[PDB]
């Protein structure tokens, strides 16, 4: 018995795997649910952390579960839970700024932008690990 998968790193009782390829926010969305996980949803500020420490270190532009695809100005993690006050201190300076239509956000740098959706980057996916 391990907590997480092959490959699947544990982090405070989740697992968390990052793609070595890119896809759209919405194809990600997808290969998160074909491998029984979701499109990172953030809940926490040490989650945040630990997050933005892999993209950082990576230098990868990186799609999180988190959209205002639906009501422009509206951020919603894709579970439903609404984009906290306590959290926006994580969006880069200058953001969200919505340039040309950007209502999907990435790790990027230091913290979060918002980018097209039809843009391939790497994902992170996060799914509870199991007891043993
Ligand atoms: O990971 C993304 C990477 O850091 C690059 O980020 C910049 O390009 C992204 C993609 O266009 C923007 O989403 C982001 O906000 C930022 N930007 C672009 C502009 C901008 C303003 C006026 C005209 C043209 C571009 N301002 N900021
Ligand atoms: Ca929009
Ligand atoms: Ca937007
Ligand atoms: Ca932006």
Same mark, same amino acid.
């Given at each position: 018995?391990?907590?997480?998968? *092959?490959?699947?790193?544990?982090?405070?009782?989740?697992?968390?795997?990052?793609?070595?390829?890119?896809?759209?926010?919405?194809? %990600?969305?997808?290969?998160?649910?074909?491998?029984?996980?979701?499109?990172?949803?953030?809940? $926490? =500020?040490?989650?945040?952390?630990?997050?933005?420490?892999?993209?950082?270190? %990576?230098?990868?532009?990186?799609?999180?579960?988190? $959209?205002?695809?639906?009501?422009?100005?509206? *951020?919603? *993690?894709?579970?439903? $839970?609404?984009?906290?006050?306590?959290?926006?201190?994580?969006?880069?300076?200058?953001?969200?700024?919505?340039?040309?239509?950007?209502?999907? =956000?990435?790790? %990027?740098?230091?913290?979060?932008?918002?980018?097209?959706?039809?843009?391939?980057?790497?994902?992170?996916?996060?799914?509870?690990? =199991? %007891?043993?």
């Amino acid at each position: 018995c391990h907590p997480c998968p *092959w490959e699947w790193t544990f982090f405070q009782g989740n697992c968390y795997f990052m793609s070595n390829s890119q896809r759209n926010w919405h194809d %990600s969305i997808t290969a998160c649910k074909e491998v029984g996980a979701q499109l990172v949803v953030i809940k $926490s =500020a040490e989650e945040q952390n630990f997050l933005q420490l892999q993209s950082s270190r %990576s230098n990868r532009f990186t799609w999180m579960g988190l $959209s205002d695809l639906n009501q422009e100005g509206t *951020w919603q *993690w894709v579970d439903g $839970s609404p984009l906290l006050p306590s959290f926006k201190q994580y969006w880069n300076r200058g953001e969200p700024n919505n340039v040309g239509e950007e209502d999907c =956000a990435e790790f %990027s740098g230091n913290g979060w932008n918002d980018d097209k959706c039809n843009l391939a980057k790497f994902w992170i996916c996060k799914k509870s690990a =199991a %007891s043993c």
